[PDB]
Amino acid sequence: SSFSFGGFTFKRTSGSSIKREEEVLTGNLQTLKIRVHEGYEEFTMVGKRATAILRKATRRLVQLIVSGRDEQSIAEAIIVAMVFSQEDCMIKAVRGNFVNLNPMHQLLRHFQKDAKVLFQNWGIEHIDNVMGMVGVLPDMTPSTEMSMRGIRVSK
Ligand SMILES: COP(=O)(OC)c1cnc(N[C@H]2[C@H]3CC[C@H](CC3)[C@@H]2C(=O)O)nc1-c1c[nH]c2ncc(F)cc12
Numbered sequence: 001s002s003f004s005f006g007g008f009t010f011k012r013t014s015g016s017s018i019k020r021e022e023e024v025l026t027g028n029l030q031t032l033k034i035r036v037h038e039g040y041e042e043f044t045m046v047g048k049r050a051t052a053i054l055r056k057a058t059r060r061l062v063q064l065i066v067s068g069r070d071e072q073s074i075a076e077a078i079i080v081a082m083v084f085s086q087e088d089c090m091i092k093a094v095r096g097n098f099v100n101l102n103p104m105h106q107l108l109r110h111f112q113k114d115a116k117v118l119f120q121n122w123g124i125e126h127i128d129n130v131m132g133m134v135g136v137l138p139d140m141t142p143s144t145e146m147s148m149r150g151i152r153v154s155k
Contacts, residue, residue: 006080006108008045015041028097034104036086049073054081061085067154071140078151079115082122083108093118123149
């Protein structure tokens with residue numbers, strides 16, 4: 001019922017997903033055969049320096065409420081969460097850029113080396129402050145009115 005990904009312990013708290021094979025095309029026109037998970041699911045991500053709740057749908061991050069102890073702790077959490085989403089956005093953030101050995105792990109290893117194109121192409125939004133949380137910009141700078149799409153930073 002538990003698994004591990006990118007140094008974070010994932011534990012599904014709700015929802016279901018079925019598997020289906022899909023051929024995607026990274027930003028560098030490289031073909032990858034990923035197993036796409038269909039359905040809405042919620043997860044706990046537990047790490048040594050960061051924790052998060054992650055709601056996702058089929059190839060879409062619905063929301064990520066993350067807390068951490070520093071900027072790189074939140075950055076690692078967000079990187080893992082966005083690679084886990086399986087979003088076409090993230091697949092296309094492979095820019096430049098071939099990846100050498102799981103496709104999902106290839107993407108994580110790639111985006112762990114640097115998430116600039118990743119963050120920079122994810123998308124930003126206005127926060128309504130209805131959760132009393134803080135937003136995070138593509139550069140990991142805090143903000144009180146804007147945040148990367150679906151990402152919220154708690155304490
Ligand atoms: C019962 O299996 P699960 O469906 O539910 C817990 C489930 C299991 N293992 C895993 N393990 C995976 C994850 C991610 C990549 C590897 C590293 C950890 C590993 C693998 O794919 O082989 N993932 C899920 C899973 C549920 N939803 C998902 N959405 C997207 C997604 F990339 C995965 C998943």
